[PDB]
Amino acid sequence: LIVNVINGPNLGRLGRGTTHDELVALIEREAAELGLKAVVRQSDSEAQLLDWIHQAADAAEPVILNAGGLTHTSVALRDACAELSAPLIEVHISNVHAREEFRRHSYLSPIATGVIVGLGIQGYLLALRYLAEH
Amino acid sequence: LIVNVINGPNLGRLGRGTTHDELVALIEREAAELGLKAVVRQSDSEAQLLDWIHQAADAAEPVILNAGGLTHTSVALRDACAELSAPLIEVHISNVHAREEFRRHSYLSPIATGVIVGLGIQGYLLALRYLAEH
Amino acid sequence: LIVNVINGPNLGRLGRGTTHDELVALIEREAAELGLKAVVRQSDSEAQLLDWIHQAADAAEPVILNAGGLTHTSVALRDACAELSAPLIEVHISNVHAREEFRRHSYLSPIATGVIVGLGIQGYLLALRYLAEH
Numbered sequence A, B, C: 001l002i003v004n005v006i007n008g009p010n011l012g013r014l015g016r017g018t019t020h021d022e023l024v025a026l027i028e029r030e031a032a033e034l035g036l037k038a039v040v041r042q043s044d045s046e047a048q049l050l051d052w053i054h055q056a057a058d059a060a061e062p063v064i065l066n067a068g069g070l071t072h073t074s075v076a077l078r079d080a081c082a083e084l085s086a087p088l089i090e091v092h093i094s095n096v097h098a099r100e101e102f103r104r105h106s107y108l109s110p111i112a113t114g115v116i117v118g119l120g121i122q123g124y125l126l127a128l129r130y131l132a133e134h
């Protein structure tokens, strides 16, 4: 049943139209409809994100991760994620391939099961549906 | 009146001749002379720096930012700064163009109003004077 | 007598055969045999690692540093380490030259006294022995 949705730096600033709290609500509702339980967490702290990934590794739970800027920069986060035995779906709200070159490189994509970008907040919901059907 | 001066990693080690406390004193005095209030904050924690940038975004206040090593490495910090509606002045005490190649690239400069480097601690004071006259 | 052994992100996950606690035990025992005192610390937080490096700088104590993913990414950590007056030995358990290209670049190596990689946990013990004989 359990899927961990982990949001990284700046994701708490969503909507300041959809706020981060509203995103949590949308994800939780969709998870319920799919027979899952979504646990949604956000932090601007890499160490906090690492701890949540460690917990998912210990629990053998899947992760939907939007790491924000750390996607492009953090080897530590990638390496934490490499311990996950369950699927890892990388999500970006924006199309990271449509702006600065540096955003087109992700440390996470090579070790993720898959990646969804540019489909807005629905990307999280589509990631949930992937996990439900697998 | 209010200008946020935000110092990143290692800036607390200044003078260990001018210490970070002495830098705060110099900035506060100059701000007073210019009819401004400077709020000076330093942290080695990226998450703390992000929170201070978020607060400046919410308050529509300008920021003078010396991000230390994060200047060259942090997309998360750049992205937080992109939310600022008021001016962002990037400051470096040292001339970052006169040593290692990696220091000559800043994630902040492309989104800053302007950048002052190599003028020592006076760089902060000159940034204050820019904001006062604008 | 005192050598600071500082472990960065993900090192707390060792053995989850040798756990991080067992690594601490092995290092402490070897330090004792060499007439040293090893102080072993681990954190997933860059800010915490920076504080431990600052303390070693203030105490003029040597550092054996395995920075984990931050080895490849953190200018802030490198810059903190540049304040150290005593030796800095960079250690990696794995051979960082035998996998992804990005692991073959270290911000720490150019400012370290030396570097040991790929010799497993014994790398820490060999670093201790270097410091003991110098």
Ligand SMILES: O=C(O)[C@@]1(O)C[C@@H](O)[C@H](O)C(OCc2cc3ccccc3s2)=C1Cc1cccs1
Residues within 6 Å of the ligand: A009, A010, A011, A013, A014, A015, A066, A067, A068, A069, A070, A071, A091, A092, A093, A094, A095, A096, A103, B075, B076, B079
């Ligand atoms: O597309 C993403 O999900 C992304 O992982 C791309 C990543 O390159 C960037 O650091 C980021 O962080 C930069 C941000 C921009 C922004 C705009 C409006 C409200 C909040 C935020 S946070 C985000 C996260 C995004 C969320 C929404 C659009 S991008």
Ligand SMILES: O=C(O)[C@@]1(O)C[C@@H](O)[C@H](O)C(OCc2cc3ccccc3s2)=C1Cc1cccs1
Residues within 6 Å of the ligand: B009, B010, B011, B013, B014, B015, B066, B067, B068, B069, B070, B071, B091, B092, B093, B094, B095, B096, B103, C075, C076, C079
């Ligand atoms: O020039 C800067 O302001 C800079 O943002 C350049 C940046 O590349 C570097 O990570 C850093 O951080 C490296 C440091 C060096 C140093 C030397 C003496 C006392 C404190 C510090 S902290 C600094 C910050 C600087 C402050 C003073 C000189 S450079």
Ligand SMILES: O=C(O)[C@@]1(O)C[C@@H](O)[C@H](O)C(OCc2cc3ccccc3s2)=C1Cc1cccs1
Residues within 6 Å of the ligand: A075, A076, A079, C009, C010, C011, C013, C014, C015, C066, C067, C068, C069, C070, C071, C091, C092, C093, C094, C095, C096, C103
């Ligand atoms: O070789 C190292 O010491 C290294 O600094 C290499 C570095 O590139 C990597 O981020 C890391 O962090 C990735 C990790 C992998 C792993 C595997 C088994 C148990 C724990 C960990 S943590 C480590 C630290 C390592 C420890 C053991 C093997 S690599």
